[PDB]
Structure formats: structure tokens, C-alpha cells
């Protein structure tokens, strides 16, 4: 009760491949599309699409930001419950250059 449920009860989003909390992100949709949740470091831009005879996509990893960059990657997230200060430490561990590659068990 007194360290999560009544101080900083936060339900963030965790990418279940790279293991982060900050770098998840609600997708800025196309004007008829639906704002999903896409990560950052699992997401590579669409430019890396070298070459079955083609590399066609089934409309899964294709998301854009408010900047408009087509990224391919970054899906498969979920909802956890962390204290917010953990998210603050994760930035301050990133400031040192130290990640927190988590594990999230329903997979």
C-alpha cells in the first residue's frame, strides 16, 4: 500500500524484446489510423529494406511519429505496475550509460 499503491502507482509500458520502459511510445497515427504502442530501439527506420523475390510487409511494424519517419520495429508491449522513481532511475542509469534489460514473464 505505502510504497506503490499510494505514492507512485504507475502503469507504464515495457517492450518485451529489448527490455525498457522509457523507450516505449504511443504511436502518432496516420489521420485515419489508431494510436498503438511502439518502442524505439527495436524500431529501425524503413530505409533499411534491402533484398522469395520481395520484402513486402503485412502492415505490422509500420508506424510513424509526429516527425513522420517510417519505422519498422518496436511492437509487442504490455502493461506493468512500477513505481515512477524506477523510471527516473532508469534515465539516470542511462545517463551513466547503464541499461536495465528487464524480463517480463507472460511470453
Partner 1 sequence: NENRETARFIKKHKKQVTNPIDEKNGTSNCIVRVPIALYVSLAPMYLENPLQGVMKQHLNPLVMKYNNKVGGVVLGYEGLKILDADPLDTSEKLIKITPDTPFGFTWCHVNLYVWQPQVGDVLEGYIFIQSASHIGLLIHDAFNASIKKNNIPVDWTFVHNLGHWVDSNGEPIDGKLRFTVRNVHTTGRVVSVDGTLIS
Partner 2 sequence: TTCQFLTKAVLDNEREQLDSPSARIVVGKLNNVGTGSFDVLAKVPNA
Partner 3 sequence: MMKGSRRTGNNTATTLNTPVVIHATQLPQHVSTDEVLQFLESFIDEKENTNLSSSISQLKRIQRDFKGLP
Stretch of residues binding partner 3 (CB under 8 A), selected from 1-9, 31-39, 59-67, 94-102: 31-39
Residue 6's CB is within 10 A of a number of other CB atoms, namely 8
Among 10, 78, 80, 102, binds partner 3 (CB under 8 A): 78
Ramachandran angles phi, psi of 77, nearest 5°: -115, 180
Q: How far is the CB of 5 from partner 2 (least distance, A)?
A: 9
In the complex, the residues that contact partner 1 under the rule CB under 8 A are: 5, 30, 32-34, 50, 52, 54-61, 75, 81, 106
In the complex, the residues that contact partner 3 under the rule CB under 8 A are: 26, 34-37, 78-79, 106-107
Amino acid at each position: 500500500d505505502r510504497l506503490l499503491n499510494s505514492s507512485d502507482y504507475t502503469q507504464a509500458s515495457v517492450c518485451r524484446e529489448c527490455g525498457s520502459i522509457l523507450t516505449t511510445q504511443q504511436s502518432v497515427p496516420r489521420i485515419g489510423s489508431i494510436s498503438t504502442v511502439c518502442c524505439r530501439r527495436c524500431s529501425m527506420r524503413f530505409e533499411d529494406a534491402k533484398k522469395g523475390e520481395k520484402i513486402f510487409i503485412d502492415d505490422s511494424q509500420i508506424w510513424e511519429d509526429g516527425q513522420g519517419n517510417k519505422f519498422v520495429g518496436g511492437n509487442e508491449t504490455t502493461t506493468v505496475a512500477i513505481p515512477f522513481v524506477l523510471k527516473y532511475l532508469d534515465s539516470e542509469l542511462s545517463a551513466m550509460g547503464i541499461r536495465l534489460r528487464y524480463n517480463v514473464e507472460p511470453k
